[PDB]
Amino acid sequence: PKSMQCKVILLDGSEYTCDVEKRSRGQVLFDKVCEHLNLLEKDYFGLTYRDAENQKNWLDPAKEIKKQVRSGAWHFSFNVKFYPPDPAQLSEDITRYYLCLQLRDDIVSGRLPCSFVTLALLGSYTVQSELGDYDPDECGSDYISEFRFAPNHTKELEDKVIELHKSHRGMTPAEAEMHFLENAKKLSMYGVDLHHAKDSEGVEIMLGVCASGLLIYRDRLRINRFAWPKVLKISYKRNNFYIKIRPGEFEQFESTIGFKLPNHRAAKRLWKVCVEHHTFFRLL
Numbered sequence: 001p002k003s004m005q006c007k008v009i010l011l012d013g014s015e016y017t018c019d020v021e022k023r024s025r026g027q028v029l030f031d032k033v034c035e036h037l038n039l040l041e042k043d044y045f046g047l048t049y050r051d052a053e054n055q056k057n058w059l060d061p062a063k064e065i066k067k068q069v070r071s072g073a074w075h076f077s078f079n080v081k082f083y084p085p086d087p088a089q090l091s092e093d094i095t096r097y098y099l100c101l102q103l104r105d106d107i108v109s110g111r112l113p114c115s116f117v118t119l120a121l122l123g124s125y126t127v128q129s130e131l132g133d134y135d136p137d138e139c140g141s142d143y144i145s146e147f148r149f150a151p152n153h154t155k156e157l158e159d160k161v162i163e164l165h166k167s168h169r170g171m172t173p174a175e176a177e178m179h180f181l182e183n184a185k186k187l188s189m190y191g192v193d194l195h196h197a198k199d200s201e202g203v204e205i206m207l208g209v210c211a212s213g214l215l216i217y218r219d220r221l222r223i224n225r226f227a228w229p230k231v232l233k234i235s236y237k238r239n240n241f242y243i244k245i246r247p248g249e250f251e252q253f254e255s256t257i258g259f260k261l262p263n264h265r266a267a268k269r270l271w272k273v274c275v276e277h278h279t280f281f282r283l284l
């Protein structure tokens, strides 16, 4: 039996290596990674890989790994797939911990925009969790933390993290992690997966997929939002992604909104992430 070596970037930035039989389905690798992480609440997570145009794809746990990575290296990342709208309801602190690690990367990367004060508050909870109670000894007036807090660091931000850290004396890691989540979960881009698209008039938009529904970011003025109840059906054809919207009571006919995606693969990827999030919505 022939086995392929897999490399998985974990959310702490470390590498996990294991072997699976070469015809293995994604679930086999995912189960190994989750066991390594002592993770039981597995349904919120997934593995991604980078394709031959270097975009993120979810590894489908039901399909052979070889038919998804195809020509590429068996290199993957471990990621949050479904962001819980209420992290306080997860059963395990270790689940909340990995969710925090993912969000820290969402913030540093700029995928999750955050005000100065929220960047500092989130950072303050990360420090409390990681180092425990504030200590002046390892924090001079010139202190800069090893922790990455934001897409752009300033001395201002470092100082505000320290000032807020001082207020958390006696907080345990699980408590600090829960506060981090209670704040992060309220950010307007929490758990929003963004896709570049053009509207039916060829105007560049962003489509966001999340637990509550679909977002169309035409720009800062006019964000259209479709709760999952409002979406009748989704479809893709060629480079096109179409959404059917229920009529208001007594209107007779649903409306169709069409979008142009970069290519066929980008359309299919959007479709699949919408289907997966809609099932998520359905079962909450």
Ligand SMILES: C[C@@H](NS(C)(=O)=O)c1ccccc1Cl
Pocket (backbone or CB within 6 Å): 228, 231, 232, 233, 234, 235, 274, 275, 278, 279
């Ligand atoms: C899961 C998906 N099915 S379908 C028939 O492909 O549109 C769906 C069905 C109703 C609303 C939204 C979505 Cl995403």
